Amino acid sequence: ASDLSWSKQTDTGITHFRAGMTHEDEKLIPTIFRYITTWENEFLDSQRVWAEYATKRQEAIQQNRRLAFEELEGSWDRGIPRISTLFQRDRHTLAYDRGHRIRREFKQYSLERNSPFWWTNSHHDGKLWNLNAYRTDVIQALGGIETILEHTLFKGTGFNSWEGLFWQIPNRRFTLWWSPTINRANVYVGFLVQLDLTGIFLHGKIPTLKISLIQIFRAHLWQKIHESIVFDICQILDGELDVLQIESVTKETVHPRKSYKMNSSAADITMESVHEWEVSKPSLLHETNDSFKGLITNKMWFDVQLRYGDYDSHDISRYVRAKFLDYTTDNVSMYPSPTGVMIGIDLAYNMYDAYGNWFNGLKPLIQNSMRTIMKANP
């Protein structure tokens, strides 16, 4: 964008560059123009390669041989027409297609879908461009395949690898794929609402996305998942009842709301002990050095806390910690003990984590449990 008032009079050297198609977090998307051989180059090049071809044809004549494409390789993709046009599957048919350019031009006047590439024909001239380069370069430039999928709901599917992927309905798929990016935590004005029966906080309505997610969690699926996990935990506790000195593993029956209610939380499992337990200070699962203070508990509680992350809220540990010492230290939905345990599952990323107090020799069981459930909960 040079000086508009001067530029009208004379050509300027370009002085000032305006920002064209900009973006926040500007990853330098390569253009297309760099990956197309500019015409002058193409034409000088053409002259060269055709000259070469001519020379080799003479050589062939002198030698009395068929000038095969084994010898002309390299120049195969160059020149105008493309050298490839010499050895395609039917030149001796296309020899009699004179007046081809004109016919292509006048398709304009005789058809609805007038072709965008009227100006050439691939049979006559071959591929005058090749944009696989553009594809490859672009993927390399958006942090690679590796990094694009952090935007997507690839982590939600839970494949072994993305490399093992290969072998208003169609755009729904597209929307669902970029669920995390599109339904993003950091956002301008978007008002928060949650979809029905779920913890899928949409930051401003999107219709297609909403449709997708709702179909995803049809049949109260979120609630079912929540309850399922709770059941599993209960089962585990029952199994390892005598190992950790537990008097009773009772399920505190909450409303169906609890599963997906986020402002509050009643405890899912309540844990009546045999003896006083001396639980550690609150900590994460993988935080190994659990500090055993003199405080004791006659009763713990286990809560699940399902969540559906975004490309911005995709750490769970922090979230679960927040949840734990939010609902404890909040005068709505009190747990029987302020000392307890809280699990949370990022359903969008399969990122389990849990925070809270720890009975001695319990942590390993919980870690293993979570590992198992994540590997295969129904």
């Binding site: 000086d3 001067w6 300027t12």
Partner: protein, 357 residues
């Protein structure tokens, strides 16, 4: 240079201009040959005020305006080597003495004595003068024997025309002497038809002299006054460096306050938005001023009469290319040059003596 945006509203502007002239005494308002009117402001702010008054309250018309040009003035560096006459008059020229320039910018015997006081000049040259604006010396050999040299009043007026519209680009002449050397008056002629010849012929002669005198173009220079806080002193210097031809002469420290009321000199061309720029750079601690009462003209660097001369169309032209650019551009402005490509040069025979032989 004003032009009304619509030629339909031209008379109004003329009327408006008249009003402006009446109201703003320090405005030479030359109506240039094209129709494009010239307005000579004292400086920037004054000029702006004038324009505001014109454009708002007298004209009430939209007005095309040239970027601020400066009234240049043609002159010489050395005495004219040749003395080529004029016909269907050979006027030599030379640079007036620098003391005498100043003396001029503010009874024959008495004047002669004065001249000898100024520059110790000869009594012959002292007697024969008739200056204006610079000096018209009637100093051939035959002129004292002759009374064809008499009735030089018409001749002097022709000389006045020369002074008004110089050879280079209708730019007024400054700081130049004019030694006459011959006149081509035949025996039988009417004073009307002879005088009439001599008037434009006088101009031609003057121009010729200038050409042969190694003509140089003179731009003016604003005397500068910049009060600034001492801490922002080198900034000013830097700015001056950024400007062209700008000199800084004494940084007199104004007692009892941080102001270093520094005098300077910016060439009137280079000066434009100087006050504003200074203010910006100085964070509004540099209430600067420009003015022109000394009449301290000076040579634009670089030499007139060059073919290639310069590089840029957009960018500011180099130091040594400058004068030529100013001349050609001003000729274009004044409509003297033919199209884009042209040249200021001598209109005389003998192939210019084969270009100085």
């Amino acid at each position: 240079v004003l032009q009304p945006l619509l030629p339909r509203e031209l008379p109004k502007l003329l009327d408006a201009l008249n009003k402006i002239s009446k109201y703003y005494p320090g405005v030479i308002i030359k109506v240039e040959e094209s129709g494009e009117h010239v307005i000579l402001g004292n400086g920037e702010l004054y000029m702006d005020c004038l324009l505001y008054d014109l454009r708002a309250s007298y004209a009430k018309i939209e007005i095309k305006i040239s970027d601020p040009l400066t009234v240049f003035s043609e002159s010489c560096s050395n005495e004219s080597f040749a003395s080529i006459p004029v016909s269907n008059i050979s006027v030599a020229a030379e640079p007036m003495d620098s003391k005498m320039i100043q003396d001029l910018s503010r009874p024959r015997k008495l004047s002669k004595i004065l001249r000898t006081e100024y520059g110790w000049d000869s009594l012959a040259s002292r007697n024969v003068w008739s200056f204006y604006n610079l000096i018209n010396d009637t100093l051939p050999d035959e002129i004292s024997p002759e009374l064809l040299s008499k009735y030089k009043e018409q001749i002097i007026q022709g000389f006045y025309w020369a002074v008004k519209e110089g050879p280079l680009a209708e730019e007024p002449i400054y700081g130049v002497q004019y030694k006459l050397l011959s006149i081509s008056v035949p025996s039988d002629v009417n004073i009307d038809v002879m005088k009439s010849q001599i008037i434009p012929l006088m101009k031609k002669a003057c121009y010729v002299g200038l050409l042969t005198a190694i003509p140089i173009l003179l731009e003016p220079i604003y005397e500068v006054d910049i009060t600034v806080h001492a801490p922002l002193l080198p900034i000013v210097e830097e700015l001056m460096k950024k400007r062209r031809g700008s000199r800084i002469y004494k940084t007199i420290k104004v007692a009892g306050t941080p102001l270093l009321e520094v005098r300077g000199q910016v060439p009137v061309i280079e000066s434009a938005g100087f006050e504003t720029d200074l203010r910006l750079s100085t964070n509004g601690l540099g209430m600067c001023q420009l003015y022109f009462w000394h009449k301290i003209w000076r040579k634009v660097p670089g030499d007139v009469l060059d073919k290639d001369a310069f590089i840029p169309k957009l960018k500011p032209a180099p130091i040594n290319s400058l004068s030529r650019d100013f001349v050609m551009k001003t000729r274009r402005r004044k409509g003297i040059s033919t199209g884009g490509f042209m040249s200021n040069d001598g209109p005389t025979l003998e192939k210019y003596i084969s270009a100085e032989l």
